[PDB]
Write a protein that binds this ligand. Structure first.
Ligand SMILES: CCCCCC/C=C/CCCCCCCCCC(=O)O[C@H](COC(=O)CCCCCCCCCCCCCCC)COP(=O)(O)OC[C@@H](O)CO
Ligand SMILES: CCCCCCCC/C=C/CCCCCCCC(=O)O[C@H](COC(=O)CCCCCCCCCCCCCCC)COP(=O)(O)OCCN
Ligand SMILES: CCCCCCCC/C=C/CCCCCCCC(=O)O[C@H](COC(=O)CCCCCCCCCCCCCCC)COP(=O)(O)OCCN
Ligand SMILES: CCCCCCCC/C=C/CCCCCCCC(=O)O[C@H](COC(=O)CCCCCCCCCCCCCCC)COP(=O)(O)OCCN
Ligand SMILES: CCCCCCCC/C=C\CCCCCCCC(=O)O[C@H](COC(=O)CCCCCCCCCCCCCCC)COP(=O)(O)OCCN
Length: 233
């Protein structure tokens, strides 16, 4: 909305933390406060939207529309945490940091699922996501194809010539070129959708990831999100 300046500060420290376990303990105050603040701010997604859609701050109507779609109540967060615990990964360290941050998450206590059950499922998903990003060859080929396509549309050398190398310069580049980066996102997603869904569906099948004891359906999830959220932007 107005002071989305606080989001970029939190984004700087998060990106400063990942650039530099040992770190996580010194920043656990920052990580705990940020999660509780994000979860208690029902308009947080809309502030993120307004960071990249600077025009929205001057359109009261569309801004209010966004609250109907993207605002989440405290109850929504509890329901999501509950739904997150119906995931099982019968196909399968840092568990410690999670098991000492998550108790300090106010809204994770209002639900109070078995924290060991939650820590386990969050820990598994987190290790799958990191391992695949690090090692899935299909995903690396896909990223490289996206990157090469992006580069025929936009001069990455010229972007760095114009000081597009900070997150503030990155946000400002996107938000002043919003239609174009939107069209590039859509064209890349539609061109590569068959392989993206396939990569992710295979990862879930491989690790035998279930939701309420039914196989996860990636096509349905992506299509649900397109219809109910990405299309209302
Ligand atoms: C960790 C949880 C994350 C969950 C989701 C979070 C991700 C958010 C990504 C934000 C990207 C911003 C892009 C905004 C602009 C999108 C386009 C749009 O807003 O509009 C249309 C939306 O439908 C379209 O297909 C647009 C194509 C996009 C559809 C794909 C998005 C699905 C993502 C699923 C995420 C799954 C999460 C868990 C993974 C197992 C574009 O469709 P077209 O009719 O072909 O073209 C016409 C456009 O010119 C009209 O505007
Ligand atoms: C490796 C990383 C793992 C980390 C996991 C964190 C997840 C990160 C992203 C979470 C974004 C989730 C966005 C929700 C999308 C769908 C929301 C939605 O409104 O659709 C509704 C959702 O219904 C569902 O079944 C969704 C089940 C999936 C829940 C997953 C949400 C996880 C949220 C956890 C919050 C983070 C807390 C972290 C600290 C405790 C469908 O409508 P309905 O069937 O009619 O029921 C609702 C009406 N009563
Ligand atoms: C260097 C590493 C950077 C990679 C990630 C980029 C960092 C920033 C990520 C941005 C995520 C923000 C998500 C919410 C943003 C809200 C988007 C939104 O409101 O929608 C549109 C505007 O917002 C945007 O354009 C955000 C687009 C973000 C995508 C940036 C990347 C583009 C494509 C590159 C790679 C393709 C990935 C595809 C994967 C299959 C609204 O369109 P419009 O208002 O109808 O047209 C305006 C004409 N005046
Ligand atoms: C780098 C980004 C990767 C992070 C991914 C971490 C995943 C943690 C958060 C996941 C929440 C995503 C929200 C999904 C919302 C789906 C909307 C929905 O309809 O909910 C339900 C869809 O089913 C679900 O809820 C699925 C539950 C979430 C599964 C999460 C596991 C997928 C992650 C696999 C790992 C992929 C690694 C990717 C690496 C790049 C409706 O199901 P239903 O009630 O049984 O209806 C009948 C079924 N046809
Ligand atoms: C730089 C950061 C990148 C973030 C990129 C996000 C940009 C936005 C792009 C689209 C994201 C799509 C996710 C949709 C989430 C909407 C949640 C929601 O609507 O809550 C409800 C869904 O509730 C659920 O079932 C699951 C609840 C999980 C909600 C968790 C939301 C908190 C997450 C905050 C996200 C913060 C971003 C992280 C970056 C620091 C709506 O359901 P309803 O009761 O049927 O209908 C009532 C309508 N309000």
């Amino acid at each position: 909305k107005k002071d989305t300046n606080e989001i970029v500060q939190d984004l700087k420290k998060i990106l400063g933390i990942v650039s530099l376990y040992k770190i996580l303990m010194e920043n656990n105050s920052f990580i705990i406060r940020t999660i509780n603040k994000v979860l208690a701010d029902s308009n947080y997604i809309i502030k993120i939207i307004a960071l990249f859609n600077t025009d929205v701050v001057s359109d009261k109507i569309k801004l209010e529309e966004y609250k109907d779609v993207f605002s989440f109540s405290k109850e929504n967060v509890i329901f999501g945490i509950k739904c997150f615990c119906d995931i099982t990964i019968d196909g399968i360290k840092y568990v410690s940091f999670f098991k000492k941050v998550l108790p300090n998450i106010i809204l994770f206590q209002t639900s109070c699922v078995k924290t060991t059950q939650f820590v386990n499922i969050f820990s598994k998903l987190s290790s799958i996501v990191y391992s695949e990003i690090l090692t899935n060859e299909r995903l690396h080929v896909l990223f490289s194809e996206i990157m090469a396509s992006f580069k025929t549309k936009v001069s990455v050398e010229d972007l760095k010539k114009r000081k597009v190398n900070n997150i503030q310069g990155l946000i400002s580049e996107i938000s002043n070129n919003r239609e174009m980066y939107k069209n590039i996102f859509v064209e890349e997603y539609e061109k590569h959708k068959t392989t993206l869904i396939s990569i992710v569906q295979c990862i879930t099948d491989n690790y035998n990831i279930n939701y309420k004891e039914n196989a996860v359906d990636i096509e349905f999830i992506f299509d649900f999100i397109q219809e109910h959220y990405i299309s209302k932007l």
